[PDB]
Design a protein around this nucleic acid. Structure first.
Length: 206
DNA sequence: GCTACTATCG
DNA sequence: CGATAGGTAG
């Protein structure tokens, strides 16, 4: 793990110079995923973050945990179904999201969601095909779940708006790059594209 | 002080 | 189409 990061960092330092320079300035990767979280939880967290900064997302989850739980633990599927969308909406979840998070909890209850062990065996493509069946869960949301919950190392969220902005100046492009362009420009980062994206994400912090 | 900053549905 | 979640950097 922290060993994967050593290897990852060395690899990004063996590509072209700009990558080597970014690693040195930003320093050690501090990305901390949470694979212990059950599928329905990581998915709800990813859904919540849609269109929202980490800070906003976190204040919303903080409330969700404080209200819909006792020991400020992440609400269980049953606790989630026992809450109405109006109440969920008061936590900061959009009305649409409140409905989707509701379906997700119900699905976890009825074992309609792939189990963790089964998710652990799915390639990203299979994972994409599987979870995309869930309302409110698509490419962006599934990459975020793969990165922050699952801890996969070769995930390049080329479709992330912020990453594209950071990619634009990192690669000195004339205009914000399309998704496919970010895809091939970061090809050399394999098999640690997650770490590559993390580093591009730290650029504002400089 | 003010604003800009995913995926779905009538 | 065109609303829609909110903390906070600029």
């Amino acid at each position: 793990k922290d060993s994967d990061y050593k290897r990852a960092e060395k690899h990004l330092s063996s590509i072209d110079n700009k990558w080597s320079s970014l690693v040195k300035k930003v320093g050690p990767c501090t990305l901390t995923p949470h694979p212990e979280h059950a599928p329905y939880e990581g998915i709800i967290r990813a859904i919540t973050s849609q269109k929202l900064s980490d800070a906003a997302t976190n204040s919303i989850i903080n409330k969700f945990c404080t209200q819909c739980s006792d020991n400020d633990e992440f609400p269980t599927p049953k606790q989630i179904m026992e809450t109405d969308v109006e109440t969920l909406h008061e936590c900061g979840f959009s009305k649409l999201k409140s409905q989707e998070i509701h379906i997700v909890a119900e699905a976890a209850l009825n074992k309609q969601i792939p189990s963790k062990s089964e998710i652990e065996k799915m390639s990203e493509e299979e994972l994409m095909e599987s979870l995309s069946k869930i309302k409110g869960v698509k490419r962006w949301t599934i990459e975020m779940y793969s990165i922050f919950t699952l801890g996969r190392l070769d995930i390049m969220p080329a479709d992330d708006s912020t990453l594209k902005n950071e990619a634009k100046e990192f690669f000195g492009l004339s205009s914000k790059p399309q998704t496919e362009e970010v895809e091939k420009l970061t090809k050399p980062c394999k098999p640690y594209r997650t770490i590559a994206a993390w580093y591009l994400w730290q650029i504002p912090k400089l």
